[PDB]
Amino acid sequence: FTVEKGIYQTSNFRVQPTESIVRFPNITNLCPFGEVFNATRFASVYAWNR
Amino acid sequence: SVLTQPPSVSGAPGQRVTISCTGSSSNIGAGYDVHWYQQLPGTAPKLLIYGNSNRPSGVPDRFSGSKSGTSASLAITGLQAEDEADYYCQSYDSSLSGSVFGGGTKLTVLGQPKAAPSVTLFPPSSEELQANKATLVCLISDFYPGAVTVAWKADSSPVKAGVETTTPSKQSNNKYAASSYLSLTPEQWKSHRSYSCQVTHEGSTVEKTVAPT
C-alpha cells in the first residue's frame, strides 16, 4: 500500500490490429466464355447451344 | 479440329477391339449423344448406332456403344471380312454450331505376301517424236504386293524430274500391275546414249535398258 519514488514496470502495451487484408492476387485469370454471347449468330429453342 | 482420333489400331481375329474417342467439354462432354459411322472405301456410309442405346434395323448386335463421361467408346467382338473401313465420331458441337466429324481409324494388320516382279521397258514409237514430247514408259507387272519404288537413270546421273508412279490395281489372278511415265523432249532424247528404269522389290533389283540408235 506504500509506494516510494522510482521507476516501476506494471504491464505491457500491445497495439492490436483492427483490420485484416488477406487478398493474395491482384486479379484472377479468365476462360473464354464471352463467345457464348458475343457470337455471329445464335441457336434456336428446339436445339440450343449447351 | 475439335475431335481427335488415333491413326490406326491393331487387333486379332477373335479378340475384343475397342476404340477411344476424346473431344471437348462442350460437344461430347456437355451431354450430347454420339453417333458412329463406317466409311467403306467405295460405298456411301450408313448408320451404325445412334445414341449408344438403340439398335437400328439391319445392324448386328456385335457393335456396342458407350459414353464414359467426356469420352465415347466403341467395342466389337471378332474381326470379320468387312471391317476394312474407317470409324468416325459424330457429335453436335455448340461452338461450331453444327455437326463435326472425327479423324478416322484404319483397321488392318497384314494381308500382303511377297512375290517376284517382272518389268518391261518400251521406247516411244516413231509417231511420238513429232509431238515435241517424249513419254518414256517402263511397265511393271505380275508382282505382289503393290509397293515398288521407281528410279530413272541415264547412265551418268539420276533423273529427278518428271518421275511418276501410279497406284497398282488387282489383276484377274490376284496380282498387281503398274506403269511409270517420264515426260521428256525428243531434242535431248537422241543425245543421250541410253535410258533405263531401276526398281527395287524386297531387295531384288532388276534393270532393263534400251538404245535409241
Ligand SMILES: *[C@@H]1O[C@H](CO)[C@@H](O)[C@H](O)[C@H]1NC(C)=O
Ligand atoms: C462482348 O462484346 C462487348 C463489345 O465487343 C464487350 O463490351 C463485352 O465485354 C463482351 N462480353 C460480354 C459477356 O458481353
